[PDB]
Structure formats: structure tokens, C-alpha cells
């Protein structure tokens, strides 16, 4: 889904 937040290249939160 689109819960994952991509803050920068290669880095994300809510990646579960």
C-alpha cells in the first residue's frame, strides 16, 4: 500500500 513514507533516496518509514 501507500502507507510507506519515502523520506529520501533509499530511506523509508512505515516499511513493515
Amino acid at each position, epitope marked *: *500500500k501507500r*502507507k*510507506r*513514507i*519515502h*523520506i*529520501g533516496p533509499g530511506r*523509508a518509514f512505515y516499511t513493515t
Partner: antibody
Amino acid sequence: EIQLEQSGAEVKKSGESLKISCQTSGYSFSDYWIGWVRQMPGKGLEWMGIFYPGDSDSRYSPSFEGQVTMSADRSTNTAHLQWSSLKPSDTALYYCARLGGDYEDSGADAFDFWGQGTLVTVSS
Amino acid sequence: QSVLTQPPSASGTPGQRISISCSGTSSNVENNYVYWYQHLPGTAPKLLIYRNDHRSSGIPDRFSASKSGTSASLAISGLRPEDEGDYYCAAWDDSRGGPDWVFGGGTKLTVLA
């Protein structure tokens, strides 16, 4: 076609409760974060927080923690911002926005589709 | 860390190129994605640029952006009267170990009449 539609202008007296609304159109409401943005009179845009309707997860900016409550109901595709006790300093323009962009196969990172805003005036 | 600084004001005459600067920190502009917004009278903030330097679909070629170090910047060539309004940079800030969104203080762009 994606649209967020916010509720109308509010003129309130201090201490009064208020829930303003953002109803979304054109995508799966559960699947995306909704962000909230305040603009005080004569000032710049300021981020309040984000809410995930799918599972009610949330992130609040430090200054908004405890001052306001983001919610949603998935039965109506409506995101909400609630104050039980409106203060004069809450007087502002409030925007709702979807966190999206769909730049990759997964996730999100830009506030792409915005509501038209809701003005809130509170006086004591 | 969680602060994007922009100059308050900018201006040019129709047909000129202008540049709007945005200054951040190691927790936002330097490594994280930067975005640019237009805010015109009567309308919601509008995404121009995403992830440092990509034009949002439908945005004209005369809008562009870049960043070096802790600074980012938005350029508008072929300045037109309807460009007049507020421009904001924004970035993901990771000072708290999570995704916080920060807006810069914004810059008022006047198209000189």
C-alpha cells in the same frame, strides 16, 4: 479524478467544540495518509500532522501533540480535525491534503491533492 | 534542524528569470527529498517540484529546482503576472527518527507592475 472536499467556514466562540471535515474522492481512502496544514493570519503554511485511515496510525508535529485530534471514518471517506475547546489562537486557514505522488510502486512522499481549505474564526 | 529558511520576498518583471532560495540542515534538505509549492490567491497549495528536482506533471518547463548541500532553490524563467504569489520549499525531516514534514517560511513573489 482525485478531489478532497473540505467543510465550510466556521465562526466560533472560544471554548466551543468543532470538528472540520475533508471528504475524499477518486482513490482508496484507506490506503493513503491524509495530512493537515495550518496557516495563521499573515503567516506561512505549517504542518500539523498526518493520519492513516486504514489503521488509525498518526504522527503529530510536536507543537500539535495534545492540542488537536486527527480522526477519520472509513464509512464515509472523511478525515477530520477536532478541537473540544477552541481557542482564539486556533483562528486560521486549515488545509487537508493526501500524501501521495505515486512515484514508485510503493509508498508516498508528496502532498499531491489538496482540499480547498476551511477558515476557522474563534473569538473570546 | 526542523527549520527551512527562505527569504521573505522576491520580485522580477514579466519575462525575467528569478530564483527562490531555501536553507535547511543535515536533518532535512541535505539528504532528504525536497519539494516546492506554489500558493496563489483563492487556491490551495500546488505541487511544482518533487524529490529535489522533478517537475510535477503539467508543470511548465520554465519551473525548475536543484539543491547543493543544505541549500535548495527554485528557478522560474519567463516570469508572468500569474506567477505572483507565495512559494514554499518543504522537506522530510528526520530529527525525531521518523517522517516529519517541514515547510519553509515561504517567499512572496511579486511580478513587478
